C-alpha cells in the first residue's frame, strides 16, 4: 500500500524529529488524494498571504479594486521583514499589485498589512474564506501578532484539508478569472522564499508553486500546487517542530515533499 508507506514515513519523521506534520493533497475539485492530521488545526502564519492575494484578485476581477491603485504609507507601516516596503518607502507608495506580489513572493509583512487594511481587515479576510466555501480558516490579527502560534490557540488557524481545498478553489475551481488565475499561479512558481522547503523535495520536472510560512514555537508551513505531468494537485503542509533548528525545519518540509513524491509516483 503506497498510502500506508506514506503514513508510515510521515510518522517516522514525526517520531524522529519530535514534530507534528499536517498534510492534505487534493485533486482540482477538492477530492482527497492523501493526508495526515488533515483536520488538525495549525497556525497559518505567512501562508494566509496566498488567500489574501486571491481576495485582492477577486476584487480586481470584480472592479471593486484596481491593481494599479497607489497605496500611500509612511514608516509606521514598516514591520519586521518588510524588504519591498522598505525599498519603496521613500517613493511613498506601493500599488495594490506591487504589494500583493511582495506579500506572496517575499512574504513582505508591511505589504501584507497595507493590503489587509484596504480589503477590510482580518474580519474581511475571514469573510472571503467563508465566501469560497472554507468554513474553517480564520484570520483574527494582523502582522506580526498573527504569527504568535500560542499552543492550543485557534486564532489565525486553518487545517491542512481546509487550506488545500481553498488552494484548489482558487487555482482550479473558478474563483478567479483566467487571467488572474494565471497571474497568481506564476507568482507562486516565482516565489523567492521556498527554495529549501517543499519544492526542494519534488522532482525537477514537476511544475510547483507555493507560499511558505514560519512562525514561533516551531511552525514551518508550505502550501500551493504541483503538476506531475498532466495531473494537477493542491497541497497544504503545516508542521510544528519546536526542538529543530531553522535549517532542520526547512529540511523537514523538504522531506515531506519527498514523501509526497513517492506516493504520487507510485500511484500512477
Ligand atoms: C510568515 O510566516 C512570516 C514570514 N514568512 C516567512 C516565510 O517562511 O515565509 C518568513 S521566514 C524568511 C523570510 N524570508 C525568508 C527567506 O530567507 N527566504 C529564503 C530565500 C532564499 C534562500 C533561503 C534559504 O534556504 O536559506 C530562504 C524566509 C517570515 C518570518 C511572517 C513574518 O509573516
Ligand atoms: Ca508613519
What domains appear along the chain, each with residue ranges and CATH number? 1-268 (3.40.710.10)
Between β-strands 42-43 and 157-158, what pairing exists: parallel, antiparallel or unpaired? Answer: antiparallel
Which atom of ligand 1 sits closest to the CA of residue 219? 2
Q: Which three cell numbers stand for residue 194?
A: 521556498
Please give the grid coordinates belonging to residue 137.
480558516
Please identify every residue annotated as catalytic: 46
CA distance 57 to 64: 10
Q: Spell out the long-range contacts of 250-253 with Cβ–Cβ below 8 A and sequence spacing 24 or more.
A: 250/196, 250/197, 250/200, 250/220, 251/196, 252/13, 252/17, 252/19, 252/21, 252/220, 253/197, 253/198, 253/201, 253/220, 253/221, 253/222
Q: Quick one: which atom of ligand 1 is closest to the CA of 213?
A: 2
The three grid cell numbers given for residue 220, joined into one nine-digit string: 514551518
Residue 218 contacts by C-beta under 8 Å, 6 or more apart in sequence?
A: 19, 239, 240, 241, 242, 243, 244, 249
Distance 75 CA to ligand 2 centre (A): 4
- Counting ligand 1 atoms within 8 A of each CB, the residue from 42, 45, 145 with the most, and so the one to mutate, is 45
d(CA 73, CA 93): 6
Closest CA to 237 of 217, 216, 252: 252
Phi and psi at residue 221, in whole multiples of 5°? Answer: -130, 160
Closest by Cα among 227, 192, 186, 151 to 46? 192
User: How big, in percent rounded to 5, are the helix, strand and coil portions of the chain?
Assistant: 50, 20, 35
Unique residue bearing C-alpha cell 493542491:
234
Between CA 173 and CA 228 the distance in angstroms is 19
Mutate to test the pocket of ligand 1, among 103, 156, 197, 213 (most ligand atoms within 8 A of CB): 213
- Please give the Cα distance from 44 to 97 (Å, whole number): 22
Give the separation between CA 253 and CA 10, rounded to whole angstroms: 11
- Among 192, 174, 194, 180, which residue's Cα sits nearest to residue 237? 194
State yes or no: cis peptide before 144, omega within 30 of 0.
Answer: yes
Residue 224 is inside which H or E element, if any?
strand 219-228
143 is in an annotated binding site: yes
What is the whole-number distance in angstroms between the Cα of residue 153 and the centre of ligand 2? 31
* Residue 101 φ/ψ, nearest 5 degrees: -65, -40
Nearest ligand (C-alpha, residue 50)? 1
> Is residue 210 annotated as involved in ligand binding?
no
* Nearest alpha-carbon partner for 97 in 114, 81, 78, 109: 114
Task: At 196, list the grid cell.
Answer: 529549501
Strands 32-36 and 157-158: unpaired
With a Cβ cut-off of 6 Å, ligand 1 is lined by: 45-46, 81, 107, 109, 143-144, 147, 192-193, 195-196, 212-215, 250
Q: Which residues contact 180 (CB under 8 A, 6 or more apart)?
A: 57, 58, 60, 61
240 DSSP β-pair partners: 20, 219
d(CA 221, CA 113): 20
Mutate-to-test residue for ligand 1 from 44, 81, 147, 149, highest number of ligand atoms within 8 A of CB? 81
**144, three cell numbers:** 506580526
Resolution of this deposited model, Å: 1.4
Angle between helices 96-106 and 178-189 (to 10 degrees): 40
The CA distance from 268 to 266, in Å, is 6
Phi, psi of 106, deg, nearest 5: -115, -5
User: What is the DSSP-derived secondary structure letter of residue 41?
Assistant: -
Show the cell assigned to 71.
497605496
The pairing of beta strand 70-72 with beta strand 42-43: unpaired
DSSP H or E segment with residue 158 = strand 157-158
Using alpha carbons, select from 184, 230, 211 the residue that is nearest to residue 56.
184
Q: Which ligand lies nearest the alpha carbon of 48?
A: 1
- Helix axis angle for 49-62 and 160-171, nearest 10°, is 30
Return d(Cα 90, Cα 5) in angstroms, integer. 54
C-alpha to C-alpha distances, 88 to 73, 95, 110, 236, nearest whole angstrom: 10, 10, 11, 32
Ligand nearest to the CA of 223: 1
Cα separation, 106 vs 50, in Å, equals 12
In whole angstroms, give the CA distance from residue 9 to residue 3.
10
Collapsed DSSP state (helix, strand, coil) of residue 250: helix
DSSP H helices, 89-227, are 96-106, 109-119, 121-131, 160-171, 178-189
Residue 124 and residue 100 in contact, taking contact as beta carbons nearer than 8 Å: no
Distant-in-sequence, close-in-space partners of 133: CB < 8 Å, separation ≥ 6: 165, 169
Amino acid at each position: 500500500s503506497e498510502k500506508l508507506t506514506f503514513k508510515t514515513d510521515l510518522e517516522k519523521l514525526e517520531r524522529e524529529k519530535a514534530a507534528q506534520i499536517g498534510v492534505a493533497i487534493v485533486d482540482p475539485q477538492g477530492e482527497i488524494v492523501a493526508g495526515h492530521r488533515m483536520a488538525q488545526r495549525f497556525a497559518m502564519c505567512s501562508t494566509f498571504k496566498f488567500p489574501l492575494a486571491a481576495l485582492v484578485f477577486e476584487r480586481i476581477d470584480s472592479g471593486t479594486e484596481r491593481g494599479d491603485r497607489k497605496l500611500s504609507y509612511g514608516p509606521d507601516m514598516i514591520v519586521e521583514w518588510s524588504p519591498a516596503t522598505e525599498r519603496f518607502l521613500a517613493s511613498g507608495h506601493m500599488t495594490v499589485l506591487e504589494a500583493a506580489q511582495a506579500a506572496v513572493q517575499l512574504s513582505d509583512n508591511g505589504a501584507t498589512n497595507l493590503l489587509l487594511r484596504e480589503i477590510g481587515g482580518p474580519a474581511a479576510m475571514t469573510q472571503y474564506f467563508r465566501k469560497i466555501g472554507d468554513s474553517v480558516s480564520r484570520l483574527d490579527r494582523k502582522e506580526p501578532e498573527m504569527n504568535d502560534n500560542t499552543p492550543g490557540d485557534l486564532r489565525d488557524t486553518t487545517t491542512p484539508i481546509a487550506m488545500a481545498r481553498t488552494v484548489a478553489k482558487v487555482l482550479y475551481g473558478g474563483a478567479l478569472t483566467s487571467t488572474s488565475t494565471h497571474t497568481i499561479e506564476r507568482w507562486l512558481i516565482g516565489n523567492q522564499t521556498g527554495d529549501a522547503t517543499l519544492r526542494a523535495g519534488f522532482p525537477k520536472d514537476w511544475v510547483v508553486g507555493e507560499k511558505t510560512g514560519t512562525c514561533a514555537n516551531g511552525g514551518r508551513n508550505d502550501i500551493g500546487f504541483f503538476k506531475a505531468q498532466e495531473r494537477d494537485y493542491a497541497v497544504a503542509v503545516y508542521t510544528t517542530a519546536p526542538k529543530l533548528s531553522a535549517v532542520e525545519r526547512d529540511e523537514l518540509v523538504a522531506s515531506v515533499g519527498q514523501v509526497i513524491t513517492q506516493l504520487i509516483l507510485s500511484t500512477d
